[PDB]
Design an enzyme around this catalytic site. Structure first.
Site, PDB file in Angstrom:
ATOM      1  N   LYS A  51       0.722  -1.270  -0.015  1.00  0.00           N
ATOM      2  CA  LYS A  51       0.003   0.096   0.124  1.00  0.00           C
ATOM      3  C   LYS A  51       0.787   1.318   0.204  1.00  0.00           C
ATOM      4  O   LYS A  51       0.217   2.400  -0.176  1.00  0.00           O
ATOM      5  CB  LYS A  51      -1.037  -0.030   1.226  1.00  0.00           C
ATOM      6  CG  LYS A  51      -1.971   1.205   1.161  1.00  0.00           C
ATOM      7  CD  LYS A  51      -3.055   1.008   2.096  1.00  0.00           C
ATOM      8  CE  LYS A  51      -4.177   2.182   2.074  1.00  0.00           C
ATOM      9  NZ  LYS A  51      -3.380   3.477   2.020  1.00  0.00           N
ATOM     10  N   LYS A  63      -6.436  -7.704  -0.750  1.00  0.00           N
ATOM     11  CA  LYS A  63      -6.043  -9.007  -1.742  1.00  0.00           C
ATOM     12  C   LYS A  63      -4.853  -9.519  -1.570  1.00  0.00           C
ATOM     13  O   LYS A  63      -4.540 -10.784  -1.497  1.00  0.00           O
ATOM     14  CB  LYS A  63      -6.637  -8.461  -3.093  1.00  0.00           C
ATOM     15  CG  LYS A  63      -8.089  -8.302  -3.485  1.00  0.00           C
ATOM     16  CD  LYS A  63      -8.215  -7.963  -4.829  1.00  0.00           C
ATOM     17  CE  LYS A  63      -9.750  -7.933  -5.122  1.00  0.00           C
ATOM     18  NZ  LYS A  63     -10.669  -6.879  -4.037  1.00  0.00           N
ATOM     19  N   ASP A 247       1.900  -3.938 -36.810  1.00  0.00           N
ATOM     20  CA  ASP A 247       1.398  -2.517 -37.103  1.00  0.00           C
ATOM     21  C   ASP A 247       2.123  -1.591 -37.782  1.00  0.00           C
ATOM     22  O   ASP A 247       3.388  -1.651 -37.198  1.00  0.00           O
ATOM     23  CB  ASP A 247       0.813  -2.050 -35.704  1.00  0.00           C
ATOM     24  CG  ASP A 247      -0.231  -2.831 -34.881  1.00  0.00           C
ATOM     25  OD1 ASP A 247      -1.312  -3.068 -35.575  1.00  0.00           O
ATOM     26  OD2 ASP A 247      -0.073  -3.350 -33.741  1.00  0.00           O
TER      27      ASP A 247
HETATM   28 NA    NA Z   1       1.629  -3.686 -32.196  1.00  0.00          NA
HETATM   29 NA    NA Z   2      -0.576   3.621  -2.378  1.00  0.00          NA
END
Ligand code: NA
Ligand code: NA
Ligand SMILES: [Mg+2]
Ligand SMILES: [Mg+2]
Ligand code: NA
EC number: 2.7.7.7
Length: 326
Positions: A51, A63, A247
């Site tokens: 955190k 979690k 691409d």
């Molecule tokens: Na790509």
């Molecule tokens: Na944080």
DNA sequence: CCGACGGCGCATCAGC
DNA sequence: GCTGATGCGCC
DNA sequence: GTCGG
């Protein structure tokens, strides 16, 4: 990777939120946390420790504590057992099928690879090709093959017009040992932010690459962006190489640095850098960096003569491509 | 508390 | 046909 | 889901 279990968990959650929940901001939140945790150089001992990192909040910390304690996440365990979520997640692995089409297919009773294959006429062109190469598109490309691909693209481009410059971007430019696809930034002095003195600049290059059987299929194509499929040639008696996504982005030549910054990524690096720009009163796209007026309206493009110039405007120390793999 | 969260190319579709 | 919204893709 | 005002 020191925290692979945690980052995998958060990536799976991100994919759930994107594909199933269609919650795009939760998707981005999860990826941001995964990325910041991935670069943290300690093996995380608690949610509290995590955190402390920008992008990890109360819910992710919780979690993380569950995962460290038990090696799993109940929330994910349940999602993995949910047939509709499972189906939707699978279908989105096909290029051209997103969260919406996936849910629609599952509604119509199309939810496996076999279903897709027998319902080709329910697919648009892009989806049809994504299905055709489903297996191939999930394979990574070894840097050695990227180098061979670079050689073909650069040389064929040169044969069309020696004034083109093609630059391989994406993870390749960040020095990755393997890439997901091949990203090519293209410039030509006839196409600048001031004028287009020659038509079909991208087309001519696509045509040439098709002519030498490098480009094999097209997912979409316009004046500045091509999205398709390519394949390395194989030798006598040699098994074929997998088909690969390619691409190509034609960028005004005078806007090359903003273009190469964009196309070098990573995607998370770009989001992080562009958000920082906004906080600093600037907006960055693949063409320009512009100040934000008192009202929020973008001002005129600022002078840019290097990638570093862009970092300077927003008061970031320069980061080489290899350090942008966020 | 709550608005903002990066920015944009191409394909497809609705409304006129 | 055009324009704007939406889906999906790219980094 | 997280952040900053
Ligand atoms: Na790509
Ligand atoms: Na944080
Ligand atoms: Mg790539
Ligand atoms: Mg990518
Ligand atoms: Na997809």
């Amino acid at each position: 990777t020191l925290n692979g279990g945690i980052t995998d968990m958060l990536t799976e959650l991100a994919n759930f939120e994107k594909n199933v929940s269609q919650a795009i901001h939760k998707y981005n939140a999860y990826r941001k946390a995964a990325s910041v945790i991935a670069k943290y150089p300690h093996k995380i001992k608690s949610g509290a420790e995590a955190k402390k990192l920008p992008g990890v909040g109360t819910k992710i910390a919780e979690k993380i504590d569950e995962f460290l304690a038990t090696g799993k996440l109940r929330k994910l365990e349940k999602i993995r057992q949910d047939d509709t979520s499972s189906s939707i997640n699978f279908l989105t692995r096909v290029s051209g099928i997103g969260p919406s089409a996936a849910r629609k297919f599952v509604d119509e009773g199309i939810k496996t690879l076999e279903d897709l294959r027998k319902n080709e006429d329910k697919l648009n062109h892009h989806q049809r090709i994504g299905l055709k190469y489903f297996g191939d598109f999930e394979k990574r490309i070894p840097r050695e093959e990227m180098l061979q691909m670079q050689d073909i693209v650069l040389n064929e481009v040169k044969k069309v017009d020696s004034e083109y410059i093609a630059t391989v971007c994406g993870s390749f430019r960040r020095g990755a040992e393997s890439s997901g696809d091949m990203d090519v930034l293209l410039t030509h002095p006839s196409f600048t932010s001031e004028s287009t003195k020659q038509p079909k600049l991208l087309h001519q290059v696509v045509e040439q690459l098709q002519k030498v059987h490098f480009i094999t299929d097209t997912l979409s194509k316009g004046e500045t962006k091509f999205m398709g499929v390519c394949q390395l040639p194989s030798k006598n008696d040699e098994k074929e190489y997998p088909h690969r996504r390619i691409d190509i982005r034609l960028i005004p030549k005078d806007q090359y640095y903003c273009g190469v910054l964009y196309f070098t990524g990573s995607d998370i690096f770009n989001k992080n850098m562009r958000a920082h720009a906004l906080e600093k009163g600037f907006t960055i796209n693949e063409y320009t960096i512009r100040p934000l007026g008192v009202t929020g309206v973008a001002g005129e493009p600022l002078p840019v003569d290097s990638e570093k110039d862009i970092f300077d405007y927003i008061q970031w120390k320069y980061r080489e491509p290899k350090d942008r793999s966020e």
